Amino acid sequence: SVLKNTSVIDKIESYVKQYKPVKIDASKQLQVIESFEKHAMTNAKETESLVSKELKD
Amino acid sequence: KAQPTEVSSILEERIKGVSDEANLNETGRVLAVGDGIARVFGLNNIQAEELVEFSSGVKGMALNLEPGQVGIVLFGSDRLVKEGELVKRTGNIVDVPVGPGLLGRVVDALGNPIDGKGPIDAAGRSRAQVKAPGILPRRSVHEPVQTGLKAVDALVPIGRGQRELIIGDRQTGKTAVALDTILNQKRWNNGSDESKKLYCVYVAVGQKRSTVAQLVQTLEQHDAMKYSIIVAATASEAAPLQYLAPFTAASIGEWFRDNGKHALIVYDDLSKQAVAYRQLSLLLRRPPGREAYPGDVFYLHSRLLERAAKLSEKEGSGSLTALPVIETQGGDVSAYIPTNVISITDGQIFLEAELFYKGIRPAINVGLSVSRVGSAAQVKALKQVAGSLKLFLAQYREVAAFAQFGSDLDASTKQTLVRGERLTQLLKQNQYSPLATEEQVPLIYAGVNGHLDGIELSRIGEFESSFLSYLKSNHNELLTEIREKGELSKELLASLKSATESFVAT
Amino acid sequence: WVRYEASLRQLEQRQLAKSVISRVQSELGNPKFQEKVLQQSISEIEQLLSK
Ligand SMILES: Nc1ncnc2c1ncn2[C@@H]1O[C@H](COP(=O)(O)OP(=O)(O)OP(=O)(O)O)[C@@H](O)[C@H]1O
Numbered sequence: 001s002v003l004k005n006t007s008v009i010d011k012i013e014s015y016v017k018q019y020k021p022v023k024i025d026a027s028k029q030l031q032v033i034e035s036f037e038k039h040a041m042t043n044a045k046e047t048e049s050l051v052s053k054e055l056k057d
Numbered sequence: 058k059a060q061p062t063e064v065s066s067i068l069e070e071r072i073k074g075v076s077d078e079a080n081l082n083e084t085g086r087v088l089a090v091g092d093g094i095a096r097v098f099g100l101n102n103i104q105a106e107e108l109v110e111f112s113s114g115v116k117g118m119a120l121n122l123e124p125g126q127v128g129i130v131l132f133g134s135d136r137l138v139k140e141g142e143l144v145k146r147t148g149n150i151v152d153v154p155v156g157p158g159l160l161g162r163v164v165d166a167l168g169n170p171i172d173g174k175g176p177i178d179a180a181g182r183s184r185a186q187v188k189a190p191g192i193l194p195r196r197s198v199h200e201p202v203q204t205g206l207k208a209v210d211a212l213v214p215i216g217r218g219q220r221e222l223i224i225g226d227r228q229t230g231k232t233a234v235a236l237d238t239i240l241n242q243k244r245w246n247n248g249s250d251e252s253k254k255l256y257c258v259y260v261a262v263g264q265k266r267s268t269v270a271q272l273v274q275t276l277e278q279h280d281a282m283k284y285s286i287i288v289a290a291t292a293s294e295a296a297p298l299q300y301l302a303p304f305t306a307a308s309i310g311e312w313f314r315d316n317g318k319h320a321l322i323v324y325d326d327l328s329k330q331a332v333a334y335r336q337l338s339l340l341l342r343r344p345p346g347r348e349a350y351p352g353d354v355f356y357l358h359s360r361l362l363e364r365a366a367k368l369s370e371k372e373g374s375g376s377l378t379a380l381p382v383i384e385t386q387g388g389d390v391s392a393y394i395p396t397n398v399i400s401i402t403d404g405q406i407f408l409e410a411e412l413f414y415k416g417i418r419p420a421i422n423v424g425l426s427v428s429r430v431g432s433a434a435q436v437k438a439l440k441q442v443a444g445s446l447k448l449f450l451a452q453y454r455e456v457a458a459f460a461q462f463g464s465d466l467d468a469s470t471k472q473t474l475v476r477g478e479r480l481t482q483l484l485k486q487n488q489y490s491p492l493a494t495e496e497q498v499p500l501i502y503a504g505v506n507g508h509l510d511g512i513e514l515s516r517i518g519e520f521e522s523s524f525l526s527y528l529k530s531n532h533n534e535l536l537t538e539i540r541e542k543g544e545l546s547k548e549l550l551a552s553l554k555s556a557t558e559s560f561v562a563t
Numbered sequence: 564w565v566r567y568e569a570s571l572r573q574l575e576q577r578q579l580a581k582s583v584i585s586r587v588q589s590e591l592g593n594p595k596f597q598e599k600v601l602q603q604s605i606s607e608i609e610q611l612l613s614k
Pocket residue numbers: 226227228229230231232233234384418419486487488
């Protein structure tokens with residue numbers, strides 16, 4: 001309303017509203033992210049099993 | 058835009074109505090006009106210091122009321138005035154409009170909107186020469202003004218109603234501290250608690266219009282113009298306007314002060330006020346005093362500055378803090394106006410070019426920079442709870458007191474040397490970056506328990522920034538607790554010490 | 564699109580300034596200067612008669 005010669009704001013306001021759903025998130029990592037973890041379980045438990053055995057040994 | 062056309066039509070009709078309701082006979086006749094001066098025969102019952110209108114349309118103030126003809130200064134140029142011109146009398150002493158619509162606007166000495174954003178909504182109209190509050194209707198300064206400058210906060214405290222002078226040389230950073238304080242007040246100016254609001258009012262006497270344009274662009278960029286008012290008296294304006302502007306701004310601030318609010322006035326470059334008064338007095342053939350200045354420049358400055366005060370609870374417990382600026386020629390503080398202003402203010406903030414070129418960006422000469430108020434008008438978190446923030450003044454005096462003449466004797470001297478130089482490198486800050494008390498406290502507290510172990514001098518700055526990060530992340534509880542309560546409790550001291558040593562080990 | 568409107572405000576007043584030049588040039592070429600003295604005469608009568 002500060003502009004008495006508006007003529008574009010409704011177009012611009014609609015332009016914001018038509019692109020109001022800009023873009024979704026990208027949660028694509030659901031197979032490789034845990035593959036880093038599957039190596040993480042493998043090596044950590046390999047280490048933990050060894051150190052637990054060796055500390056008593 | 059037809060609306061301004063009928064607005065102007067009704068303007069012209071009330072113009073006629075006002076003009077043809079005078080039937081004056083004491084309207085004087087101009088005898089002679091000088092360089093912005095006009096002696097006039099007439100105005101038998103003119104009051105002193107009273108405004109006038111010339112038939113051309115230039116305003117004038119009644120300084121000299123000698124018998125017969127009257128000494129009139131000119132608010133503007135003597136361009137349009139001649140001899141034998143009828144001089145209209147206002148009927149009232151020179152006045153300036155006051156009100157809350159001033160915020161966000163730029164006006165001139167008289168108070169006319171000069172920014173070009175329309176008229177001014179004024180809640181009242183106060184005098185330019187009002188009496189300072191008496192001995193009783195006032196209260197001592199206790200609430201501290203948070204500058205955002207660590208060297209100006211933890212070392213030279215200022216508060217509501219005091220008078221701190223930024224004494225220094227040209228382009229040393231005199232306006233920088235003032236604008237930094239104005240930006241820093243935004244933290245509480247955006248809230249609802251009116252007892253903590255600090256509206257800013259700023260004078261520009263003599264500075265060129267380009268400088269004030271850059272300045273106002275600055276305040277609007279950081280979104281501080283909404284609570285600031287700028288009065289401008291460029292060197293292009295006549296000497297009377299420059300001489301009058303600071304008084305009008307003082308009345309503007311006194312509006313807030315008497316209405317129970319809190320405000321801050323920056324008397325920027327009050328010396329050109331003195332030179333404009335010199336031009337006034339000399340052009341009026343008033344006998345000069347020392348080095349061609351008018352005698353009553355001390356009274357001029359006293360009456361202007363002492364209007365700033367901290368009111369007591371009976372009248373509303375309002376406040377008005379003066380922040381004058383004086384520039385000295387070659388560091389000569391023995392000069393007349395510098396001596397008067399150092400004797401008139403409630404302390405000073407010395408800035409010199411030598412420390413500025415030494416790297417110290419604030420360039421605060423802690424040796425001379427002193428405040429007449431210490432513990433009073435200081436946040437308690439930067440006080441006895443921190444312990445040494447009661448006595449860093451002595452520490453920075455002694456570290457300067459053993460630089461080479463007090464050469465290092467034993468390990469204590471080496472420790473004090475390292476401590477002092479690390480601190481001086483720590484107090485450095487950059488312009489346009491105000492800081493807050495809750496993160497002042499950790500940095501200087503680290504300056505007592507582990508500062509010599511800082512990671513070499515050139516990398517103590519990111520040390521302080523990373524300390525601030527390590528306390529804003531994972532340690533926000535400390536910052537909060539010290540920012541609402543304003544002091545450091547015993548368990549709070551223990552937690553702060555633990556955090557400081559934890560990042561020291563880091 | 565706001566300061567363009569603001570500049571539209573400022574420029575519009577500027578041609579109104581030269582419009583006054585067209586207005587004032589119309590003011591100087593009239594017999595009203597003869598008629599205008601009667602306006603003072605009736606006005607000054609209304610002025611002092613109030614007192
Ligand atoms: N903390 C700072 N960091 C960087 N530059 C600074 C700092 N403080 C001041 N300066 C610089 O110092 C110069 C002078 O500062 P400022 O604008 O405050 O002028 P001043 O001392 O008020 O002088 P003048 O009377 O000429 O207006 C400017 O170039 C400014 O950018």
